[PDB]
Design a binder for this molecule. Structure first.
Ligand code: DHT
Ligand code: DHT
Lengths: 277, 277
């Protein structure tokens, strides 16, 4: 009857706002499983759910740790309807800093949550979709998945990885009737200094500050409401033939095109260096 | 005096051929540390070294496991010259199959060797390069880093990740005088069926066969000599101002451009589906 949606990473941000947008939809078309790594963070989702007056039974929370394939399987068994019509792979971690200041565990964690975590969800959920010959997968992407950003080396690695993962899968899934799309987000309004200085050189440290200053100004001028981003997920959801990629904004497309039409990377690296520094 | 080169993944392929090309250079400009995960595989490198008559002391082998930051640090201490002029990040794993048939450990291993392994090398070696204000980093890339290939979902994820990692770093390293370049390789002439069938559906299994058939024909028609690929690394090495990206072939550039100029991904996914299936 209803469209069953399971969303990862609902404790804040896009995931939180998408979950309550869908559950509160005036048409009541959606049953939403909002999943979270730590149940102690669920308060914010329930406060938003109340604000939007989600009908009882339109929204349920599950604990799901995308690092643990047992946790993934336990949450899938909790989908009482026995299918997922829309899977939204949104859990993700950022990681910001000079590459040599990043702990090895932090690097592996970002990769595990952002890439392997999405692999675990797709392994768990794609089979029943392929069998039914139907289902929609939406994956939260980033501008940092489409072009490299300084001091985001590992975050960008992880978001570029989701691009390759999803594009590869889409080439195969086409004749199966299962549609996968990336939702490419720019900024969204959702170590300490001594720590970082201890792990890098003064010149890199200064470039980091410059990057942070520029980033803050891009964010204050350009950040989108998660309400507006969530509606782009909805657009993808309802598209009779969805495309592989949706963009939540036109903002970064000129930078992207400059990347796109000089494959040597020389124009992009130059332009981004000037843009930031 | 000599240009000190440390290359990862020298047991076969590009890494093996690049190592002996450099060590055997008639000019004797290069001292090469060819590194390998398992020393039992070093025979092939030494057979090639003899064939090309590398002078004694032009080539040394080190054991290096890019999964282990202690192994990385132990090999760096073995660079008797106390600097690395050229770091070649080439170790890599493939992974081929229906996504749901891939073991979780195999997925994590590919990511660890191909992405985190390269992060470990850059963390270990970039600091002294930035300090000197000089050094060249060359990273073995792939066509699968630039466009998604069906049944290579995790391999492509890993090779897309190297793109984001390197591009992000290049934006920063520009004013430091340290130059990083990807060398984008097409095919290079360097589970059992019951296993895979047990882990997927018959229809995906059949698409896998089709992909393998097409792949084999692309390889037989298009595979390059690693001798020819190694010379593209040399070109990058010697370029007074290197670009971010070198391509070893023009072959896949029409497919890439079609990807590049439809950001929605719709033309690429369609064209690649038709190309393979
Ligand atoms: C990381 C930031 C800033 C913080 C964030 O939420 C993600 C966002 C993605 C767009 C980036 C931006 C930093 C400034 C950049 C790099 C602009 O120059 C162009 C794209 C911007
Ligand atoms: C994985 C393969 C085949 C095996 C290999 O060594 C890597 C190589 C990269 C180019 C791929 C190719 C498979 C066939 C493809 C997908 C062609 O259609 C275009 C690019 C090709």
């Amino acid at each position: 009857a209803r469209t069953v949606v399971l969303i990862t990473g609902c404790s804040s941000g896009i995931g939180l706002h998408l979950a309550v947008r869908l559950a509160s939809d005036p048409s009541q078309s959606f049953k939403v499983y909002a999943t979270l790594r730590d149940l102690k963070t669920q308060g914010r989702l329930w406060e938003a759910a109340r604000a939007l007056a989600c009908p009882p039974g339109s929204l349920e929370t599950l604990q799901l740790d995308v690092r643990d394939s047992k946790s993934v399987a336990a949450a899938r068994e909790r989908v009482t309807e026995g299918r997922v019509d829309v899977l939204v792979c949104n859990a993700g971690l950022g990681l910001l800093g000079p590459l040599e200041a990043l702990g090895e565990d932090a690097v592996a964690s970002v990769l595990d949550v952002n890439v392997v975590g999405t692999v675990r969800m797709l392994q768990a959920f794609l089979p029943d979709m392929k069998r039914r010959g139907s289902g929609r997968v939406l994956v939260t992407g980033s501008v940092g998945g489409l072009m490299g950003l300084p001091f985001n080396d590992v975050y960008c690695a992880s978001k570029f990885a989701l691009e390759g993962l999803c594009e590869s899968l889409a080439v195969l899934l086409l004749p199966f009737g299962v549609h996968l799309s990336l939702i490419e987000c720019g900024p969204v309004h959702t170590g300490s200094p001594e720590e970082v200085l201890d792990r890098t050189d003064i010149h890199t440290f200064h470039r980091f500050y410059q990057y942070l200053a520029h980033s803050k100004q891009v964010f204050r001028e350009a950040a989108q409401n998660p309400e507006e981003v969530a509606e782009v997920f909805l657009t993808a959801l309802r598209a009779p033939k969805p495309t592989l990629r949706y963009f939540t904004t036109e903002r970064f497309l000129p930078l992207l095109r400059m990347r796109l039409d000089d494959p040597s990377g020389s124009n992009y690296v130059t332009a981004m260096h000037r843009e930031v520094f």
